[PDB]
Design an enzyme around this catalytic site. Structure first.
Site, mmCIF file in Angstrom:
data_model
loop_
_atom_site.group_PDB
_atom_site.id
_atom_site.type_symbol
_atom_site.label_atom_id
_atom_site.label_comp_id
_atom_site.label_asym_id
_atom_site.label_seq_id
_atom_site.Cartn_x
_atom_site.Cartn_y
_atom_site.Cartn_z
ATOM 1 N N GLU A 1 -32.696 -8.074 -20.622
ATOM 2 C CA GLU A 1 -32.303 -8.358 -21.418
ATOM 3 C C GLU A 1 -30.321 -7.759 -21.607
ATOM 4 O O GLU A 1 -29.021 -7.882 -21.077
ATOM 5 C CB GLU A 1 -31.767 -7.460 -23.306
ATOM 6 C CG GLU A 1 -33.674 -8.498 -23.037
ATOM 7 C CD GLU A 1 -33.616 -8.700 -25.934
ATOM 8 O OE1 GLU A 1 -33.382 -7.632 -25.847
ATOM 9 O OE2 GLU A 1 -33.518 -9.685 -25.603
ATOM 10 N N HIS B 1 -39.048 -9.102 -22.876
ATOM 11 C CA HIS B 1 -38.381 -9.935 -22.918
ATOM 12 C C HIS B 1 -38.651 -10.481 -21.592
ATOM 13 O O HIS B 1 -38.461 -9.613 -20.868
ATOM 14 C CB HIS B 1 -37.085 -10.132 -23.289
ATOM 15 C CG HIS B 1 -36.926 -9.078 -24.757
ATOM 16 N ND1 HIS B 1 -36.344 -9.945 -25.663
ATOM 17 C CD2 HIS B 1 -36.685 -8.068 -24.883
ATOM 18 C CE1 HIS B 1 -36.309 -9.088 -27.050
ATOM 19 N NE2 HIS B 1 -36.990 -8.015 -26.675
ATOM 20 N N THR C 1 -31.976 -6.314 -30.367
ATOM 21 C CA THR C 1 -31.512 -7.464 -29.835
ATOM 22 C C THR C 1 -31.745 -8.437 -30.355
ATOM 23 O O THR C 1 -31.149 -9.894 -29.615
ATOM 24 C CB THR C 1 -31.829 -7.099 -28.021
ATOM 25 O OG1 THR C 1 -32.671 -7.750 -28.052
ATOM 26 C CG2 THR C 1 -30.744 -5.827 -27.725
ATOM 27 N N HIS D 1 -39.078 -3.232 -24.238
ATOM 28 C CA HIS D 1 -38.612 -2.520 -25.473
ATOM 29 C C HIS D 1 -40.382 -1.356 -26.520
ATOM 30 O O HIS D 1 -40.647 -2.149 -26.953
ATOM 31 C CB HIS D 1 -38.045 -3.374 -26.146
ATOM 32 C CG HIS D 1 -36.739 -3.746 -25.142
ATOM 33 N ND1 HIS D 1 -36.556 -4.728 -26.069
ATOM 34 C CD2 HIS D 1 -36.141 -3.254 -24.565
ATOM 35 C CE1 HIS D 1 -35.104 -5.082 -25.561
ATOM 36 N NE2 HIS D 1 -35.304 -3.943 -24.299
ATOM 37 N N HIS E 1 -41.899 -15.542 -31.244
ATOM 38 C CA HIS E 1 -40.110 -14.963 -30.655
ATOM 39 C C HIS E 1 -41.032 -14.103 -29.094
ATOM 40 O O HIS E 1 -40.297 -14.244 -28.471
ATOM 41 C CB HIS E 1 -39.433 -14.270 -31.499
ATOM 42 C CG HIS E 1 -39.156 -15.023 -32.563
ATOM 43 N ND1 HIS E 1 -38.000 -15.828 -32.424
ATOM 44 C CD2 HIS E 1 -38.929 -14.590 -34.156
ATOM 45 C CE1 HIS E 1 -37.793 -16.650 -33.619
ATOM 46 N NE2 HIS E 1 -38.046 -15.482 -34.793
ATOM 47 N N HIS F 1 -42.544 -4.024 -27.008
ATOM 48 C CA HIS F 1 -42.692 -6.180 -26.824
ATOM 49 C C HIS F 1 -41.794 -6.042 -25.588
ATOM 50 O O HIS F 1 -40.915 -5.164 -25.120
ATOM 51 C CB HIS F 1 -42.377 -6.663 -27.468
ATOM 52 C CG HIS F 1 -41.125 -6.277 -27.968
ATOM 53 N ND1 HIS F 1 -40.297 -4.952 -28.806
ATOM 54 C CD2 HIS F 1 -39.941 -6.217 -27.217
ATOM 55 C CE1 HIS F 1 -39.099 -4.800 -29.431
ATOM 56 N NE2 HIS F 1 -37.971 -5.924 -28.031
#
Ligand SMILES: NS(=O)(=O)c1c(F)c(F)cc(F)c1NC1CCCCCCC1
Ligand SMILES: [Zn+2]
EC number: 4.2.1.1
Length: 257
Positions: free
Chosen positions: A103, A93, A195, A116, A61, A91
């Protein structure tokens, strides 16, 4: 299973996790002008000098860096928080192009990525237990804009070729998360959620106002990762972000102005 695709992505999550349509879901659009300065917020304290990174892994992911959170190292306290929250992982995104990937959004602006740093409330003794509680986690969110490089990110970028596919990992010691922080600790804060599935409403979000600058070369390295495992059909790991969710009854506070 869940993912970020057309048939398994954010619009589908509520079927397995009905809290997806809850009252405290993340991320949200931060309206910088209606954010309420709150004078009762205490000074925010990020104490990362004794942080001990352990490993970096591709979980199918995103990728995450795991820290040794078995001791009183790398803590976040103050701000909106009661008590002490310990860093357990960070991590990112990111997007398939520089114009999307974050996000949270800021006055509708999407950044190219979002970092994050995940901490758990030490009253709960570990991160899993903490994630079951409304006050269980605090996530420090940092935007990434593309421009000059972030030298402190380079250690991460340079190992990503070693964890291309799902289930790859590598030892990753002595990584200093202080090198991913912008100059200012001014922030917004609001109550929200994970999230990703299971979308637990357990997170006190702390989103820093100032982005960090990373280079196009750095972000391009994120985009070479794969969601799939080795020997499975290739799917590039891009666009692993949940879009903004309704604010509902909540207020976003600002630490400044
Ligand atoms: N997004 S988050 O809200 O900060 C977050 C948490 F707070 C957390 F406790 C655990 C989480 F899984 C997440 N999301 C994933 C997102 C990316 C794919 C897998 C890597 C792990 C992190
Ligand atoms: Zn995240």
């Amino acid at each position: 299973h869940w993912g970020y695709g057309k048939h398994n992505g954010p619009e589908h999550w509520h079927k397995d996790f009905p809290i997806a349509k809850g009252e405290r879901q993340s991320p949200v659009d931060i309206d910088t002008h209606t954010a309420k300065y709150d004078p009762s917020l205490k000074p925010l304290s990020v104490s990362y000098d004794q942080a001990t990174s352990l490993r970096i892994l591709n979980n199918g992911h995103s990728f995450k860096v795991e820290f040794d959170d078995s001791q009183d190292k790398a803590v976040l306290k103050g701000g909106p928080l009661d008590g002490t929250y310990r860093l357990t992982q960070f991590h990112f995104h990111w997007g398939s192009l520089d114009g999307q990937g974050s996000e949270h959004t800021v006055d509708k602006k999407k950044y190219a990525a979002e970092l994050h740093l995940v901490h758990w409330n030490t009253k709960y003794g570990d991160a899993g237990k903490a994630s079951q509680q409304p006050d269980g986690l605090a996530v420090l969110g940092i935007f990434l804009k593309v421009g000059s490089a972030k030298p402190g990110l380079q250690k991460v970028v340079d190992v990503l070729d070693s964890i291309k596919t799902k289930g790859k990992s590598a030892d990753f010691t002595n990584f200093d998360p202080r090198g991913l922080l912008p100059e200012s600790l001014d922030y917004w804060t609001y109550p929200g959620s994970l999230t990703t599935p299971p979308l637990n409403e357990c997170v006190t979000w702390i989103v820093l106002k100032e982005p960090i600058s990373v280079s196009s070369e750095q972000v391009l390295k994120f985009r070479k990762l794969n969601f799939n495992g080795e020997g499975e059909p290739e799917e590039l790991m891009v666009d692993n972000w949940r879009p903004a969710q309704p604010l509902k009854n909540r207020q976003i506070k600002a630490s400044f102005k």
